[PDB]
Amino acid sequence: AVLKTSSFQLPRHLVPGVWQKAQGQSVLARLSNAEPQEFGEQQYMTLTAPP
Amino acid sequence: RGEVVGESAEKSESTATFAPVTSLVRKVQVTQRFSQEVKWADESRQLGVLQT
Numbered sequence: 001a002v003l004k005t006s007s008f009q010l011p012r013h014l015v016p017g018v019w020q021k022a023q024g025q026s027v028l029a030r031l032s033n034a035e036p037q038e039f040g041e042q043q044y045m046t047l048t049a050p051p
Numbered sequence: 052r053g054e055v056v057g058e059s060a061e062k063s064e065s066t067a068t069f070a071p072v073t074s075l076v077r078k079v080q081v082t083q084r085f086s087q088e089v090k091w092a093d094e095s096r097q098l099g100v101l102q103t
Contacts, residue, residue: 045098045099045100047103051081051083
């Protein structure tokens with residue numbers, strides 16, 4: 001029979017890098033700034049009514 | 052106002068009229084009251100409550 005590349009069983013060439021579907025980032029990290037905090041529940045004062 | 056008059060027609064007068072108006076005088080106060088404990092809490096914890 002004639003010689004074919006079928007007989008050699010070549011490995012596939014492997015292309016560099018990984019293809020990805022992108023993901024949405026945080027919006028809250030863009031829309032309001034982080035503040036320095038210490039570990040625990042925080043508490044904040046609000047004005048309920050002016051004089 | 053101007054008046055139109057004939058040759059020997061008796062002329063009228065139409066003098067301007069004036070009146071005064073006066074400002075009222077209005078005194079406005081705001082008083083806020085709080086415990087000395089509120090001063091101690093704010094000044095120790097740096098809350099900004101008395102500055103606001």
